[PDB]
């Protein structure tokens, strides 16, 4: 609403993981998900430090990440690494598997200047991770820490990050999902973390068992909304297995929601991802009285179809849908959202947060 | 022919394969649909388990275990005999030091005998370094692990009984799928030294050396009934293939898992049609002259359709008296080229067979001369 960026935030750009073994982690995400082999940076094309791989599918970019043998790159320093990321860590990444498991490490915003989103940044409060550095004079990176170690990564362009082969041959699955919607992260305290992130960043707020504010930058494009506990807990039980703060789930927008359910729900026994439990058919029976006029009879029967959630806000309306836990700790997830209204361009799409983001159906599933 | 039959214990077949993922729930889900096996067995949060995620894939009489450590501060209170797992041989910190070692690797070799207990006393009593003493599950199974090479370990799995581990809920109907792959062929392990390795392990054991190589010295270990095989290799200096493994993998761990098949052309195009989709991608085809010379070698046992379908599919092929060799290896299962897997159908050399000669037609050491080293 007031429209106070401290810098240039374009919209997000990639999401990358932590893992211990990156191929096994993509191949299924690539499979669960119906995303394209884009980039690649491992052993194979030269890369001695991590075996990072790059799936996109739309605007959407996840990058899953494991590092090597330390053995293999003893012989390097900083400036003469052969990572194609500067600010990887071998220690760093092993205690953040060996503690959080698998999850969200990074969380990625294109900006115009990435330097300038830093010293910006650093300059009103941030915890600085690793400096900006120039990778090839074509891309600048930087990363401030989120939250707990969650960083928030800047990029600046003058298809990817240099150091990557493009995967164009025969060695492109595409089911709806096109970017990423928000990305929601628990941290114990909601106090300090609005104070700390929104202190640096300047986005504003947009508008049982839990207390959430979301984040929005300039256009509402960005949106990072953080939850905290209420004391049983569902949040508390993320914090317990997550072994401290960090990503809950990643909202994945879908331009088609009916879809892409049915090329991921008939494919969660081979391999894809789980969801959770549909709702009775009363919770579809008293749906086609409060959004009776967005959705007609026979899309909302399509709804159950699939268990579909849907909630309604000022001048919107969103489909969502929840998978169960990516890893194996009851800890990160992926939501699935599609938006309806609220498109208002001057010469096309929509707006940002068009329905909420869901709170709407805290009620509703308990009747 | 040349067998002993000079076994220190009663051991019937081989079992399950135990992988310490870092995180069995997409590992597992990639070999489900990558190799095509079925989930039949879980122990984890959903059935009461909070010292690790294990999930269970079997197709035929093939196991593989999937097994992940949780927080260790989810079993803060807990003590020795008070213990969650299903498995009491696991330990956090073994099993966080060998992913952060050896990465992606198998963790365990089970063997299912007559007697744990007494293939536990007899090993360990012979030069053996034990792993784990046995562990009576449910008053049902008994577990004994002892060191093998580097930090793989030999389990041994017995049954007072003439379906899994105790504690592993069953999946109730996971999809059955089931691309052809039936059981455990043989298990390869990398060694600097194979002198040493085979003094040591059938030292413990009993088992004799099987008789029915550019880059490495190979020395197959086979059982009583034959049908346990495990071979061993050696790199030869003058880079080595296994020299390649003992720098990435740092030390001594399972090379290959070869996986018998009622047909190689049938579990080869499910798993090359999903090498691009989470599947395995696969080495890359021998030249068409390869084809060329094998209609005239082994045309008499394989058809012009099937010698034909092995050169779709790029199948190496080798042949020994009494049976023939189909043989094919995927690309490294994990991040580094150190696991991967191999896909074996025999042929001839039968018998009764109710309900095949134990590693009849050689191992593929024909094609280390025909294809390439
Ligand atoms: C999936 C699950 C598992 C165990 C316990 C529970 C409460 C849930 N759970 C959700 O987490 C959930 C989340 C949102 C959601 O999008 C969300 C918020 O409502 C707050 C703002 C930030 C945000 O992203 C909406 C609906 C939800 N519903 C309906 C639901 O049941
Ligand atoms: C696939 C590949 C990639 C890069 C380097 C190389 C040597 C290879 N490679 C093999 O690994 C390979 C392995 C076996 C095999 O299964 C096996 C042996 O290694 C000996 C001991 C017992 C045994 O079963 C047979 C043939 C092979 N051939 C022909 C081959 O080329
Ligand atoms: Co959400
Ligand atoms: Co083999």
Known sequence: NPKSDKFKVKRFHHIEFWCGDATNVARRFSWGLGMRF?????????????????????????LFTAPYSPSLSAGEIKPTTTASIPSFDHGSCRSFFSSHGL?????????????????????????????????????????????????????????????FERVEDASPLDYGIRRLDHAVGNVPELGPALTYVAGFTGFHQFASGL??????????????????PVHKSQIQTYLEHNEGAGLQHLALMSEDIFRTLREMRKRSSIGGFDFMP????????NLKK????????????????????????????????????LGDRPT???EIIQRVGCMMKDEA???????????????????
Do not use: W
């Not at 884009?38 to 996840?62: E, I």
């Not at 007609?296 to 029967?301: E, G, L, R």
């Not at 947060?353 to 308990?366: A, H, V, W």
């Open 103 to 163: 999850g969200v490490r990074a969380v990625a915003i294109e900006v115009e200047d990435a330097e300038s989103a830093f010293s910006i940044s650093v300059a009103n409060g941030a915890i600085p991770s690793s400096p900006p550095i120039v990778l090839n004079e074509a891309v600048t990176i930087a990363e401030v820490k989120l939250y707990g170690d969650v960083v928030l990564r800047y990029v600046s362009y003058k298809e990817f990050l240099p150091g």
């Open 38 to 62: 884009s980039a690649k940076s491992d052993l194979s094309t030269g890369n001695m430090v991590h075996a990072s791989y790059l799936l996109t599918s739309g605007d959407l970019r996840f």
């Open 278 to 285: 549909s709702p009775p058919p009363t919770y579809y029976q």
């Open 290 to 325: 409060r959004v009776g006029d967005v959705l007609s009879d026979d899309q909302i029967k399509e709804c159950e179809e699939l268990g579909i959630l849907v909630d309604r806000d000022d001048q919107g309306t969103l489909l969502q849908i929840f998978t169960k836990p």
């Open 211 to 228: 207390n959430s504010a979301v984040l929005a930058s300039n256009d509402e494009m960005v949106l990072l909304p953080i939850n905290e």
């Open 349 to 367: 799409y929509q707006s940002g947060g068009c329905g909420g983001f869901g709170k709407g159906n805290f009620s509703e599933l308990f009747k």
């Open 332 to 334: 990160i997830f992926i």
